[PDB]
Structure 1
Amino acid sequence: GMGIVMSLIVLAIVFGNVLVITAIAKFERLQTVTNYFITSLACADLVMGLAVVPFGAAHILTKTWTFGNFWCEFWTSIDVLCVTASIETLCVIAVDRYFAITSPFKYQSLLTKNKARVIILMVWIVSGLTSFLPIQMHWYRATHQEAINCYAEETCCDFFTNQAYAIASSIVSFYVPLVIMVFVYSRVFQEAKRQLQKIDKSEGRFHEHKALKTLGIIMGTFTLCWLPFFIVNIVHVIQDNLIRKEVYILLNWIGYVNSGFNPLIYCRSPDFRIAFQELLC
């Protein structure tokens, strides 16, 4: 029953991301500074849909981790790495649009291909420092009976953490990008409204929905997909025996689903649509 859905999710995540990557790679008219961030985001989503989802589905359905403890730790590390590096690229895209709209004269000098590469490697390094380093060095393990038994067992792979790691990772992965995106998009909306009023005041008699709809889609999908999990992540650590494991896994998978929506949001340009027609059909 659940296998068909859990496989359809995998195919949906893989297909769109690989299509976007190959469309950007094959055609030379899409090679833009903005598209490098989209390429990085697509790579992160593809790695997520290729590695994290199938093994989580197998663990849920089989109700047993048939691999070793080393593979459980590796799977957790790659999970955190893929989740952190995907959210933080949306912040970079928002900041790029902010600089493009608010400061049009200096935008060309502000960003260059070398600067884009430096930023991308910086974000990937920061994402990798918070996932592999604190997990492989065993700085995140809990110190109660259930956690100790889970760590000792060879077939049980679960998630138990301290409070320090939970708040630190949650803040770094989600909360810092959120306020930046909110501020940036509010300023962009204000500028768009100002320009619309300026247009109306000059030639109105001769002859906000669009911006509102665009910003609403962009912010709503991300917030609705990733907020409940990053609230319960703090809550279950602060007070014990309030959040059931089933709710935790359900919210985590709802967050995972977001990887299949990004090509539908950031790749609707007419140019992208043309390439997709030549590539397919």
Structure 2
Amino acid sequence: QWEAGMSLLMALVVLLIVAGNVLVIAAIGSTQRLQTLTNLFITSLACADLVVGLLVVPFGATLVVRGTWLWGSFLCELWTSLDVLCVTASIETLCVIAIDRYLAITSPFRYQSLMTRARAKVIICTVWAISALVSFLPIMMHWWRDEDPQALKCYQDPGCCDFVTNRAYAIASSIISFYIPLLIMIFVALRVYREAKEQIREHKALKTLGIIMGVFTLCWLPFFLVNIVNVFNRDLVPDWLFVAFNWLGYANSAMNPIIYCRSPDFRKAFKRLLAF
């Protein structure tokens, strides 16, 4: 009855994720002084994290603790698609924030005169449309099915919701959803770091964004490294370890609100907003 021990723990992780990310979104939405363009992009992140806390983790927990999928074959597919979507939209929004800040530091005047709150809302829309496309459509079309009997048995069993995929899908989805935006985020972030260094409160706020980026990479990159090792040698990566690395990724959705707590502007605004 580690089954009940884990059930309660999982419900608290949900709470933390969901409450933290609601708090961030409520701070941004109730403080005019905190509605920078950047923070509009942060809104998108907190939303992806919020969908993780409300939909992805709760259904995931049930799989983890009971060891079977209870929610039918269609919700198995939908759950998986929304999980994959949240991760994709998160890393694409982080790579947009890296690029945005690189242009903000190298051309502050131009940038502030020609990005607006509406033009950001459009970028964000695009991101979620691309995310949804690369996530939902391949899953819906069953492009991810493998031909091995083990795989086929899982797909015919409504009670199996392991993302057992073919090699081609595993590689391609991982490149497109994660490895290329990660590589871009890192390349661009290092250039922002270079230019800041050349130039020397502004810099403390840039530091927070760097931390978010590094932490997101540490949380998700284990899973994505393992994803690739496993397409090459299926025996190499035990399932419980794969699952542990996936939960490290889910944990990222609890982390952002906590990191935002340490920005001084955000803190103040949370104090005000909460009758506190």
With structure 2 as the length reference, what TM-score do the two structures score? Answer: 0.91
- Report the Cα offset of residue 50 of structure 1: 0.4
> 1:192–1:211: 8 Å Cα contact kept in structure 2?
no
User: Is 1:189–1:211's contact at 8 Å kept on the other side of the alignment?
Assistant: no
Gap runs ≥5 in structure 1: 197-208
Residue 70 (structure 1) aligned to one of 59, 71, 74: 74
Q: Distance in 2 between matches of 1:240 and 1:274?
A: 50
Q: How far apart in 1 are the matches of 2:210 and 2:128?
A: 28
Give, in angstroms, the shift of residue 79 of structure 1. Answer: 0.9
Counterpart of 2:121, as a letter, is R
1:58 partnered with 2:62 = yes
Which segment drifts farther, 122-131 or 156-165? 156-165
| Structure 2 unaligned regions, length at least 5 | none
For residue 270 of structure 1, the aligned residue among 256, 264, 270 is 264
Structure 2 residue 167 is matched with structure 1 residue 137: no
Instruction: After superposition, give the CA deviation of every residue in 1:125-182 in whole Å (9 maximum; x if it has no partner).
Output: 1100111111111111111010111111232222211112111111112111222222
Inter-CA distance 276–163: structure 2 relative to 1 (3 Å threshold) = same
Q: Which residue of 2 aligns with 1:203?
A: none
Distance 1:68 1:216 in 2: 41
Give the whole-Å Cα distance in 2 for the aligned partners of 1:113 and 1:16: 24
Work out the CA distance in 1 between the residues paired with 2:16 and 2:205: 28
Are the counterparts in 2 of residues 94 and 185 from structure 1 also a CA contact under 8 Å? yes
Q: Does the CA-based 8 Å contact 2:91-2:182 persist in structure 1?
A: no
Is 1:189 the counterpart of 2:193? The answer is: yes
Mapped contact 2:260–2:266 kept (Cα < 8 A):
no
The residue matched to 1:66 in structure 2 has which SS? Answer: coil
Whole-Å Cα distance in 1 between the matches of residues 210 and 100 of structure 2?
A: 19
Partner of 1:234: 228
Moved more, 72-81 or 174-183: 174-183
Residue of 206, 217, 226 corresponding to 2:211: 217
By how many angstroms is 1:4 displaced? 2.5
The secondary structure found in structure 1 opposite 2:109 is coil
Instruction: Judge conservation of contact 1:38–1:266 (CA < 8 Å) in 2.
Output: no
CA distance in 2 between partners of 1:267 and 1:126 (Å): 30
More moved, 174-183 vs 221-230: 174-183
1:176 alignment partner, SS class: helix
Query: Identity rate of aligned residues, in percent?
Result: 66
Local SS of the residue matching 1:241: helix
8 Å Cα contact 1:185/1:215 also seen in 2: no
Q: Match of 2:108, SS? A: coil
Question: What is the CA-CA distance between 1:210 and the residue it aligns to?
Answer: 6.7
Q: Which residue of 1 aligns with 2:248?
A: 254
Count of aligned positions: 269
Task: Tell me which of 210, 222, 237 is aligned to 1:243.
Answer: 237
Q: Tell me what 1:202 maps to.
A: none
Partner of residue 86 from structure 1, selected from 90, 112, 121: 90
Shift in CA distance, 66/142, structure 1 to aligned 2, threshold 3 Å: same
> Are the aligned partners of 2:30 and 2:273 in contact in 1 as well (CA < 8 Å)?
no
Q: CA RMSD in A?
A: 2.0
Contact 2:208 2:259 in 1 (8 A): no
Give the match for residue 48 of structure 2. Answer: 44
Between structure 1 and structure 2, the one with the greater Rg is 1
Can you list the C-alpha shifts for 1:113-134, whole angstroms capped at 9, x where unaligned? Answer: 3321221111101100111111
Task: Please give the secondary structure, in 2, of the residue aligned with 1:168.
Answer: helix
Is 2:21 aligned against 1:17? yes
1: CA distance, partners of 2:9 / 2:267 = 28
1-structure distance, mates of 2:119, 2:42:
15
Of 118, 122, 128, 1:124 maps to 128
Distance change in 2, residues 1:156/1:194 (3 Å): closer
**Letter of the structure 1 residue corresponding to residue 37 of structure 2:** V
Alignment partner, residue 34 of structure 1: 38
Amino acid at match of 1:234: I
SS in 2 for 1:73: helix
Amino acid at match of 1:155: G
Matched position secondary structure for 2:234 = coil
Q: Distance in 2 between matches of 1:171 and 1:267?
A: 32
